[PDB]
């Protein structure tokens, strides 16, 4: 098969991948802490056919050589870590983050993931969990009869008991920051796992060593700019139509070749 057909095919696949990215990005409005995802493409190695000659410069001459090239392979889907807006849930166990940082979470298989999501609850045993039962680390266990919970601006979580005029300090909810936040491996369920492209996680108390602060009762919103997505949808649709035209033109030329 000739190069034109497959080059236009990879153009069509790239536009399809961009549309997949946009559709996922648009479905995840109203997903707390979600980060918009941007597809980044790249060209492929150019097959040179005839090297250019020398510019003799005696007369103005066209510098004609020949390289054809191919392909628009998707090279990345970056994650734009900009701070999203906050929404008031009035929910005491909810929490949002001020600046860089993630919550460390123990997965059932034993590894530690990380989430920018604050819709916490408590299991039947009192441990902090994340809408899916993932324990938050280090484990924070609430007594049975707490009148109220308070998570301060640096994660010092405390409860009030009937009778004590003092909120016994029950735990610390510390953060974790990464050297390259964008490199995280999003495994779904609003959790990322650290990889070689992100570096080892650096754990610290909120507000110290570059980690953000904590806002109790508020949850972070998805930072998806729907105007960007709509205009990108128009772009993707028209680029798809253009590449479809390219495929059609090449196919018609091949038909004319094979008639004789």
């Amino acid at each position: 098969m000739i190069s034109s057909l497959w080059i236009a095919k990879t153009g069509l696949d790239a536009q399809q991948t961009n549309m997949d990215v946009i559709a996922n990005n648009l479905a995840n409005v109203s997903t707390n802490g979600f980060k918009r995802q941007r597809a980044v493409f790249e060209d492929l190695l150019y097959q040179t056919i005839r090297q250019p000659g020398a510019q003799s410069s005696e007369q103005t001459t066209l510098p004609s050589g020949l390289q054809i090239g191919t392909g628009v392979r998707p090279v990345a889907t970056e994650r734009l870590h900009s701070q999203g807006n906050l929404s008031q849930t009035n929910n005491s166990k909810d929490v949002a983050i001020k600046g860089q940082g993630f919550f460390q979470v123990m997965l059932p298989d034993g590894t530690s993931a990380y989430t920018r999501d604050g819709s916490f609850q408590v299991d039947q045993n009192g441990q902090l969990v994340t809408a899916g039962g993932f324990q938050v680390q280090p484990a924070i266990t609430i007594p049975a009869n707490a009148l109220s919970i308070t998570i301060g601006r640096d994660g010092v979580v405390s409860v009030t008991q009937q009778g004590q005029a003092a909120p016994v300090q029950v735990g610390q909810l510390n953060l974790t920051t990464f050297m390259n936040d964008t490199g995280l491996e999003s495994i779904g369920e609003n959790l990322y796992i650290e990889t070689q492209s992100s570096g080892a996680p650096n754990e610290s108390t909120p507000g110290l060593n570059g980690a953000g602060l904590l806002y109790q009762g508020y949850v972070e919103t998805s930072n998806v700019n729907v105007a960007e997505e709509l205009v990108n949808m128009i772009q993707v649709q028209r680029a798809y139509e253009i590449n479809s035209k390219a495929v059609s033109t090449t196919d018609q030329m091949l038909q004319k070749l094979t008639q004789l």
């Binding site: 034109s4 628009v72 600046g99 110290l208 570059g210 772009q235 028209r238 030329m253």
Partner: protein
């Protein structure tokens, strides 16, 4: 009878043009992509009598150095060059390629890497402290503020070297990176100066300059030319076949 060859040439070479357009056209929405404009060269066949034939060899005179149009992303370290500007990047083999892709990235260990094979500025590859929080200025200076330090500590950590070169004095090098043409090397030398007049537009990226209008008629004319060549080939072979009856009997 040899006319068919010339016609074949045209047909074959037209397909090459198609190929170029296709690669030129799939690469819309590729950051900073430079459209590879193409032309057809007449090639006379100087011979011993009656110079009548010419071939149709296909060629790519260069790239279209027309600045593609900008997308505002507000990302702190997405860079857009002014016209005729280039970011210098340490190529795979190791040499200063030139790109218009300002989609800069930082690794965990602080290597500024426009898509990897990192970026070159005022020295080797630019390195920044790991807690970067990079900001890029208008003339190329790069300042870094560690997240947990007072904001009056944004002392500049590097400079992003930029180079002026366009069109006739730049050619693609079998990667997305451009180099000088070796005709612009007994000139402004192997490694260009920083040209401290090329400006940076921060928070803005540049898209490809793939003109859909001229590509669509590129393809229309290509198809029409191809099937004209097929008509010539058909007539030539039918001529030869009906001619072959001379020699018999």
């Amino acid at each position: 009878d040899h006319a068919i060859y010339t016609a074949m040439g045209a047909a074959s070479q037209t397909l090459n043009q198609q190929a170029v357009t296709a690669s030129n056209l799939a690469n819309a929405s590729t950051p900073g992509f430079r459209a590879q404009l193409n032309a057809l060269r007449a090639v006379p066949v100087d011979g011993l009598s009656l110079a009548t034939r010419t071939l149709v060899t296909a060629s790519t005179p260069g790239a279209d150095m027309t600045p593609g149009q900008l997308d505002y992303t507000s990302r702190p370290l997405d860079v857009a060059l002014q016209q005729d500007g280039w970011l210098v990047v340490q190529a795979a083999d190791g040499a200063e390629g030139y790109t218009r892709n300002g989609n800069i990235q930082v690794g965990p260990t602080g290597q500024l890497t426009i898509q990897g094979h990192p970026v070159i500025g005022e020295g080797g590859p630019i390195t920044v402290p790991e807690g970067s929080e990079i900001t890029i200025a208008a003339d190329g200076t790069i300042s870094a503020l560690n997240p947990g330090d007072p904001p009056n500590t944004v002392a500049p950590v590097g400079r992003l070297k930029l180079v002026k070169a366009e069109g006739n004095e730049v050619q693609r090098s079998d990667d997305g990176l451009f180099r000088l043409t070796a005709e612009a090397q007994a000139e402004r030398g192997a490694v260009l100066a920083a040209d401290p007049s090329i400006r940076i537009m921060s928070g803005v990226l540049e898209g490809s300059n793939v003109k859909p209008v001229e590509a669509m008629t590129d393809m229309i004319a290509n198809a029409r030319r191809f099937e004209m060549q097929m008509k010539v080939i058909t007539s030539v072979d039918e001529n030869e076949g009906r001619a072959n009856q001379l020699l018999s009997m």
